[PDB]
């Protein structure tokens, strides 16, 4: 179910997107107060990362292919390594460091 | 409102490169597009290149394909445009120009035209060098009066590249002054004379003084013109 596959391939964690998806929206005064601002927050970010995704050109998708080409220098393994020998934890502790550069190349885009 | 300023004049050697920078005043940089023209002399007008900064990818013609480079810099808010391998005929007037643009959406863009226009540059390539100007004063006499109005005016020769720029009296005095346009002598170097006409009673009592300036040999001449002594 929830996060089954975190130990899994990336290959086979990609056939499980809605599992995670679907848990992340539902799944005294002093206690009202402090339950009421968790939900806000999910909410808010639910909806930030809604607006990024329709920002990107990929409103209501869960797989989404763009025009934005791969640098080597980002990454130098290839597919066979990668979505058959590597989970997505190991991935992005190795492509934290481009995340920045990669999605304002996918704003800048799809805007022009 | 908008302007644009460029740079002097470039004089160069077939083979090698050229550059040359536009300014802009009044408007945002970076969601203005920018235009590269060329004119030669005697011949039309030839739309060089031009791109939008934001966009980031400019438009080129296939003829200058490969030759041609344009940049930006918003820092500066200043546009720069390459030519390399510079042959005969690239001797010319470069201007720079700009017009507003709008979206559509979907990587659709629109434009309007050029508006606004600079003052243009002035780019020659040849195996000469150069050559300071040679001012002598064409100083007016009783053969040069007609009618109470008498002629003068100051010829310039042994200079080269143009252009060579002449005002009178700091530009105070505007009305009859004719520039005929530079010639080429079998010397290979260009000649010109600026006359005007005034009336004869202000021979005596106006001074008159002839500036001239060649930027690409730094020259600043001011001639004064008097009738010859007799
Ligand atoms: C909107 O605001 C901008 C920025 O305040 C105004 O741009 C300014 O426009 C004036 C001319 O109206 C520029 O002055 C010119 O500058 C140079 C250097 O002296 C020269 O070309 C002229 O002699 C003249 O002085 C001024 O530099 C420019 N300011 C900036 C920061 O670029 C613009 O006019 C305003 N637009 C409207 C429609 O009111």
């Known amino acids: 179910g929830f996060l089954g596959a975190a130990g899994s391939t990336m290959g086979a964690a990609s056939m499980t997107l809605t599992v995670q998806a679907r848990n992340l929206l539902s799944g005294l005064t002093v206690w009202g107060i402090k339950q009421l601002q968790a939900r806000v927050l999910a909410v808010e970010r639910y909806l930030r990362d809604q607006q990024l995704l329709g920002i990107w050109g990929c409103s209501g998708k869960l797989i989404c292919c763009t025009n934005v080409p791969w640098n080597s220098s980002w990454s130098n393994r290839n597919l066979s390594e990668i979505w058959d020998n590597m989970t997505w934890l190991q991935w992005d502790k190795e492509i934290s460091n481009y995340t920045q550069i990669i999605y304002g190349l996918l704003e800048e885009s799809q805007n022009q | 409102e908008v302007q644009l300023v460029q740079s002097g004049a470039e004089l160069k050697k077939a083979g090698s490169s050229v550059k040359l920078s536009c300014q802009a005043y009044?408007?945002?940089?970076?969601?203005?597009?920018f235009h590269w023209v060329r004119q030669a002399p005697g011949q039309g007008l030839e739309w060089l290149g031009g791109f939008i900064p934001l966009v980031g990818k400019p438009n080129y013609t296939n003829k200058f394909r490969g030759r041609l480079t344009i940049t930006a810099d918003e820092s500066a808010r200043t546009t720069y445009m390459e030519l390399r391998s510079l042959r005969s005929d690239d001797t010319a007037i470069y201007y720079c120009?700009?017009?507003?643009?709008?979206?559509?959406?979907?990587?659709?863009?629109?434009?309007?035209?050029?508006?606004?226009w600079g003052q243009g540059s002035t780019v020659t390539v040849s195996s000469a060098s150069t050559k300071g100007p040679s001012v002598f004063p064409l100083a007016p006499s009783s053969k040069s009066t007609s009618g109470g109005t008498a002629a003068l005016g100051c010829l310039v020769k042994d200079y080269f590249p143009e252009p060579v720029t002449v005002s009178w009296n700091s530009g105070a005095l505007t009305s009859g002054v004719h520039t005929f346009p530079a010639v080429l002598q079998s010397s290979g170097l260009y000649s010109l004379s600026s006359v005007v006409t005034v009336p004869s009673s202000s021979l005596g009592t106006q001074t008159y003084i002839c500036n001239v300036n060649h930027k690409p040999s730094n020259t600043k001449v001011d001639k004064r013109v008097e009738p010859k002594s007799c």
């Open positions: 009044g408007v945002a940089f970076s969601t203005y597009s």
């Open positions: 120009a700009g017009g507003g643009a709008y979206s559509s959406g979907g990587g659709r863009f629109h434009y309007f035209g050029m508006a606004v």
